[PDB]
Ligand binder design. Sequence first.
Ligand SMILES: Nc1ncnc2c1ncn2[C@@H]1O[C@H](COP(=O)(O)OP(=O)(O)CP(=O)(O)O)[C@@H](O)[C@H]1O
Ligand SMILES: [Mg+2]
Ligand SMILES: [Mg+2]
Lengths: 179, 104
Amino acid sequence: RIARDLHDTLGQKLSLIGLKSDLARKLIYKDPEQAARELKSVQQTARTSLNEVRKIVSSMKGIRLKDELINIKQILEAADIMFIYEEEKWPENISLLNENILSMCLKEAVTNVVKHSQAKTCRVDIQQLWKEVVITVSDDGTFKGEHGLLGMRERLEFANGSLHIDTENGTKLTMAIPN
Amino acid sequence: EERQRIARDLHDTLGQKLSLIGLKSDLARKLIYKDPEQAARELKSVQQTARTSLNEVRKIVSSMKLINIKQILEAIMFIYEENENILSMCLKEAVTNVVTCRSD
Ligand SMILES: Nc1ncnc2c1ncn2[C@@H]1O[C@H](COP(=O)(O)OP(=O)(O)CP(=O)(O)O)[C@@H](O)[C@H]1O
Ligand SMILES: [Mg+2]
Ligand SMILES: [Mg+2]
């Protein structure tokens, strides 16, 4: 996973930084022009490696719940669906990891609204109850069915939480996760 | 805090090594003609830092992914007589540092 990306994209860059380096050395007196070229190559590869790092560190830190909310506001307004959120007391101390899980889920949910729902409006509820945080997303558009969905289910279930789908007044997704 | 530790270490050591590869590379370039033996020295320095980054990636990977302490002690006599993450990592470092040990 994280290991294959690290080892591969980053590994291959770093390996290459060494090889090109060593080549440019071999050419300092025989072909200084070609040493020079080789090293701009080195610097370009090193810069992009820094990008790779950025990305990896970003996945592993996890998206924050708050930031995911902000994001879904943006997304729905861009799809012209109306964003309703009656703000209430914030989740006590949810896991840093569980909070990512919720953010990822909420993401794919809201996405499915802008994609299939034909919805006018979309409600988002975040509430802390018992020793578990539950987020609800409903949308007033007809359900189109009966990847992403089974995905939420599983992420959330290895988590020890659950997912429900209700297609009576649209599609109301309910994710719950322990802390 | 474990994915948080890992993101942090990756960004730390690899952040720095890659900037250094940046700057040194750029220097050797500046020196190809005005000072080639120095350009060469600089570049050996770049290769070495690429090596050590490869090592660092290698090790972090190893943290996500006892016989070993025994033969590492051999190569200095040791005694032993018989959460997983924290305990194995911490004992590994413990004996790396001691390199008689039942704890030495
Ligand atoms: N809010 C919604 N309104 C209406 N239908 C929905 C819906 N959310 C999901 N669906 C239905 O579920 C189907 C598949 O959902 P899922 O998210 O698993 O796949 P998808 O079609 O979004 C592509 P991906 O697998 O890349 O997400 C859709 O084709 C659609 O019929
Ligand atoms: Mg989908
Ligand atoms: Mg030590």
